[PDB]
Amino acid sequence: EAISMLTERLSSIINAAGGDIGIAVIHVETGHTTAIQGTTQLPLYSVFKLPLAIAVLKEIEENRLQLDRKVRVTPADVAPGWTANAAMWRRPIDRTVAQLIEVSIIRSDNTSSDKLLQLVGGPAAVTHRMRALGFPNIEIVSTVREFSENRTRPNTGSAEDLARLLVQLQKGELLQPQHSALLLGFMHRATTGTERLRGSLPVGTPVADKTGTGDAGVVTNDVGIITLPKGQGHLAIAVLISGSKLSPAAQEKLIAEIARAAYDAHVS
Numbered sequence: 463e464a465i466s467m468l469t470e471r472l473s474s475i476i477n478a479a480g481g482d483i484g485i486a487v488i489h490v491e492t493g494h495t496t497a498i499q500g501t502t503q504l505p506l507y508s509v510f511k512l513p514l515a516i517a518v519l520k521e522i523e524e525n526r527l528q529l530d531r532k533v534r535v536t537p538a539d540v541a542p543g544w545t546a547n548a549a550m551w552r553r554p555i556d557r558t559v560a561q562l563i564e565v566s567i568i569r570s571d572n573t574s575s576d577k578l579l580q581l582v583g584g585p586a587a588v589t590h591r592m593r594a595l596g597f598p599n600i601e602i603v604s605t606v607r608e609f610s611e612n613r614t615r616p617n618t619g620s621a622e623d624l625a626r627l628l629v630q631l632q633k634g635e636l637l638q639p640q641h642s643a644l645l646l647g648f649m650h651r652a653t654t655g656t657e658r659l660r661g662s663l664p665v666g667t668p669v670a671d672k673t674g675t676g677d678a679g680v681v682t683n684d685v686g687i688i689t690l691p692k693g694q695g696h697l698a699i700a701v702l703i704s705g706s707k708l709s710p711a712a713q714e715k716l717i718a719e720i721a722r723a724a725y726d727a728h729v730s
């Protein structure tokens with residue numbers, strides 16, 4: 463029956479991909495869950511910026527921080543190898559906490575993410591916030607710089623915990639309404655995953671997403687929320703691909719095809 467056999471189809475889409483692949487698809491309103499290796503913790507790379515943004519917004523909601531607090535960013539905060547977004551960080555600049563979350567989510571900025579990581583108390587504090595919220599299978603152990611000088615101790619998370627996190631975000635149970643609207647607005651405008659969760663959906667499908675990419679196709683990740691048409695609800699979806707044999711383009715196409723299969727199963 464269409465959602466019953468989604469696991470069969472997902473398993474054949476990723477067959478012979480090699481590596482380690484975790485998938486979780488959760489229908490937000492009903493809770494219907496489809497998972498493949500859904501409890502295995504896999505390298506997150508830039509996907510960790512989504513738990514980071516939640517921990518930052520929890521700090522504001524727990525009255526230890528403000529959205530409009532000015533934070534000074536200097537070229538000293540940019541790691542050497544960070545080439546993608548470094549153009550905004552060449553002379554000292556003041557950004558509000560809201561603006562730091564913005565650029566870290568939309569542009570997958572490493573510099574602003576590491577600044578936010580310090581504001582909340584480092585990797586251990588984010589890991590604690592995750593279990594305090596109900597997601598004990600998300601372990602943040604490294605800053606972005608630390609991990610960049612040696613890929614050995616990566617931040618990991620299971621696909622099911624990321625999807626469950628997105629379910630509560632979409633439902634309005636995770637953050638205050640204005641913080642939920644603010645974060646989903648950022649994720650709707652994210653520009654790093656045009657070929658992934660959005661790649662194969664029908665024209666006009668709203669998608670909020672956060673990607674993760676390692677160099678040379680070592681890791682290709684995408685987690686997000688797909689708005690179904692009609693009044694059919696939302697899909698929280700996490701795809702974590704680690705160490706695949708496939709080329710980068712084919713790994714992105716794997717994510718796009720997984721999303722379209724989950725979309726098709728849950729739409730009438």
Ligand SMILES: *C(=O)[C@@H](NC(=O)/C(=N\OC(C)(C)C(=O)O)c1csc(N)n1)[C@@H]1N=C(C(=O)O)C(=C)CS1
Binds near residue numbers: 613654
């Ligand atoms: C999150 O996953 C970030 N990724 C990285 O910092 C790494 N590589 O980034 C790219 C741009 C793919 C590169 O070729 O250098 C990375 C860190 S440790 C490792 N083995 N690789 C951000 N992701 C992207 C993206 O395009 O998804 C960015 C635009 C900026 S860094």
